[PDB]
Amino acid sequence: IEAGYEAVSRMKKHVQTTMRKEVLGGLGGFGGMFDLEEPVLVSGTDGGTKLMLAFMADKHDTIGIDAVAMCVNDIVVQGAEPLFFLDYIACGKAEPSKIENIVKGISEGCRQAGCALIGGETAEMPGMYTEEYDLAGFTVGIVDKKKIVTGEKIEAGHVLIGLASSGIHSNGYSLVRKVLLEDGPLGEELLKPTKIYVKPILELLKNHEVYGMAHITGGGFIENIPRMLPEGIGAEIELGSWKIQPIFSLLQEVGKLEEKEMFNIFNMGIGMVVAVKEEDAKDIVRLLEEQGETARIIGRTVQGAGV
Amino acid sequence: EAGYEAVSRMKKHVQTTMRKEVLGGFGGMFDLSKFALEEPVLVSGTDGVGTKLMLAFMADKHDTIGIDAVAMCVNDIVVQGAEPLFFLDYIACGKAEPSKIENIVKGISEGCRQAGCALIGGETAEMPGMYSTEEYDLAGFTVGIVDKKKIVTGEKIEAGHVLIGLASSGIHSNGYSLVRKVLLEDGELIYGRLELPLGEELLKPTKIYVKPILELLKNHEVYGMAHITGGGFIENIPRMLPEGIGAEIELGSWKIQPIFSLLQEVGKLEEKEMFNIFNMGIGMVVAVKEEDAKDIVRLLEEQGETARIIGRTVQGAGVTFN
């Protein structure tokens, strides 16, 4: 039905809700190009188990933020400015409504991340799938060479700032399920999408000297925080300097899991960390609150190793 | 565990793809500090392999399709006059056999070698029961850079302009569902006129036209290019051609692989149909002036391509043969 696809195409006045000036516009901007000091490109892609909730709940308008989230947060942590987004939706038989729903959510993370949805595609893959689909994302960011923050300016004792997560985000969702497969509202919280920190960082970097940043994905703080730390340097979190979610405290009891254990799977209520010079932590903490983020002095840098 | 340090070592297929421009390594980096463009523009694109993959599950050959994935992305780039810089892959599977995944990036690297782009990143997803054991998926994503003045869209193509076609490796990457439909209706893999084992003919990877296409452009005026993919000639030649301009194709100007013949004989297809699905031996078309047409043909063949004056531009609409 090429008619239904007609009115399915016009439906993407969604993508334009992501558009930026730089887009030498194709469709609504779909298919177009991106117009471009000492320019360096930063790219990323991200295909998680968090999709399982969506298949069941049959609710797909927010799963595409997480995606955008998991791509763009990792580019901006290198102080790069996200420009455009490409999506790949592997599909049994495209449910014209489902597709549109999922791209309704992609264009919402794109708006927030402040990048254009210049392209993407729905794959009719007859056989692999029945209520399922896979969602992939691709991103390109830009940075000035001498401005890349790659935390080698991380000196012992810097104040560590932690920006507030909305819940699980995109990781741990297999342990979540087993824990509450071992057990028995739940789903609205677990369908909570991953926060995007792109805009507030950018205006942060525009104002302050950011020593280093990290995105709390991987295996919790322990994987990710040291990740930014330089040799002979460390990171000590003052437990109780931020508000941890009922979700996390919840899985802590239910599965009866260990603290240090959970800290290596789950964000434990904190989505991102940037290292800051003790004399500035105050007003930049202020600045981010000014950005609608939950900033807090989570701990500090030390000379050593780990968390 | 111990098998991953080694599987991350054999990942050296990327080393074979690298350019000076690629900057050291949460998101690969490419330097644009020496490109000497004055109105620089980024042209990107993503595509997923498709129905061809089903035949790579059958033959258990996984190191070439990645050339298929790259080729589609990259040919769609240079055809607008850009230069592919870097590529990112996304592979989806139930779970990953480090080897099998190694063969996929192995043909992704190669394809990237030929396209001349860096393999700067990629994801590998061991998925639940969403994917079976044999069954996997493969999407790619490219970025190319062009100067705002050097873009080609076809609007400048005119009546009496000369269409050259660059030959293809065979089916490339389009029409395989209809191919399979007579695999069913037919009988499976050496058939008829000049021939390899049938499956082996079918799994021939898509041609990558990048390196020649940029050399062209460095030496001559190109008014259009069409990547003959989905919808074959009937879909893709029209789309480069402005209003009032149609196309005349001279059926004997190029070589049609026997598999297209087979498919038509065996499948009882019409020629119009065939040309609305299959490339029929020509993977990419480029409108040219008449006065250059013959130089261009040799520049391309000096490039290592097979290039034929395939037809011409007229007043009208769509495509017409003779």
Cβ <8 Å between A134 and B92: yes
Which residues in chain A belong to E strands, given as ranges?
A: 23-24, 33-35, 39-46, 81-91, 116-124, 133-144, 159-164, 212-215, 234-237, 270-276, 297-302
User: What's the CA gap between A236 and A246, in Å, rounded?
Assistant: 23
Q: In this structure, are residues A187 and A53 in contact, taking their beta carbons and an 8 Å threshold?
A: yes
Q: In this structure, are residues A74 and A44 in contact, taking their beta carbons and an 8 Å threshold?
A: yes
Interface test with B, best of A22, A23, A30, A43 (most B CBs within 10 A): A43
* Domain B153-322 fold: Phosphoribosyl-aminoimidazole Synthetase; Chain A, domain 2 (3.90.650)
Q: Report the CATH superfamily, name and number, of domain A1-149.
A: PurM-like, N-terminal domain (3.30.1330.10)
Cβ <8 Å between B90 and A88: yes
Nearest to B69 by CA among B35, B98, B102, B106: B106
User: What's the CA gap between A17 and A13, in Å, rounded?
Assistant: 7
Cβ <8 Å between B23 and A40: yes
* Biggest CA pair distance of chain A: 65
Q: In this structure, are residues B48 and B72 in contact, taking their beta carbons and an 8 Å threshold?
A: no
Q: What is the dihedral of CA B207, B213, B216, B221, to 10 degrees?
A: 130
Residue A57 corresponds to which amino acid? A
Cβ <8 Å between B27 and A132: no
Cβ <8 Å between A123 and B48: yes
Beta-ladder partners of B36: none
Beta-ladder partners of B126: B93
* Backbone angles phi and psi of B17, in degrees to 5: -120, -15
Q: Which of B48, B88, B146 sits opposite A45 (nearest CB)?
A: B88
B107 contacts: CB under 8 Å, gap ≥ 6:
B62, B63, B64, B65, B66, B67, B68, B205
Q: In this structure, are residues B305 and B211 in contact, taking their beta carbons and an 8 Å threshold?
A: no
- From chain A, pick out residues whose CB is under 8 angstroms from the CB of B48: 88, 90, 121, 123, 125
Whether A150 has its CB under 8 Å from any CB of chain B: the answer is: no
* Biggest CA pair distance of chain B: 66
Return the number of CB contacts < 8 Å for A and B: 143
Q: In this structure, are residues B117 and B124 in contact, taking their beta carbons and an 8 Å threshold?
A: no
Q: In this structure, are residues A289 and A162 in contact, taking their beta carbons and an 8 Å threshold?
A: no
User: What's the CA gap between B123 and B238, in Å, rounded?
Assistant: 36
Query: Domain segments of chain B: what residues?
Result: 1-152, 153-322
CATH architecture, range B1-152: 2-Layer Sandwich (3.30)
Could you say which residues from 84 to 123 on chain A have a Cβ atom under 8 Å away from some Cβ of chain B?
84, 86-88, 90, 118-121, 123
User: What's the CA gap between B310 and B201, in Å, rounded?
Assistant: 24
A43 contacts: CB under 8 Å, gap ≥ 6:
A75, A138, A139, A140, A141, B27, B28, B29, B30, B86, B88, B120, B121, B143
User: What's the CA gap between B27 and A81, in Å, rounded?
Assistant: 12
DSSP code of residue B189: -
What is the experimental resolution, given in Å to one decimal place?
2.3
- From chain B, pick out residues whose CB is under 8 angstroms from the CB of A88: 46, 48, 90, 139, 141
Whether B191 has its CB under 8 Å from any CB of chain A: the answer is: no
Nearest CA in chain B to A84: B44
* Sole residue written with tokens 């020496």: B34
Whether B260 has its CB under 8 Å from any CB of chain A: the answer is: no
Cβ <8 Å between A145 and B33: yes
Method: X-ray
Residue A30, classed as helix, strand or coil, is: coil
User: What's the CA gap between B53 and B76, in Å, rounded?
Assistant: 20
* Domain A150-307 fold: Phosphoribosyl-aminoimidazole Synthetase; Chain A, domain 2 (3.90.650)
Give the neighbor-by-neighbor strand order of the sheet with A297-302: A212-215, A270-276, A159-164, A297-302, A234-237
Name where chain B breaks: residue before each gap, C-N > 2.5 Å: 25, 189
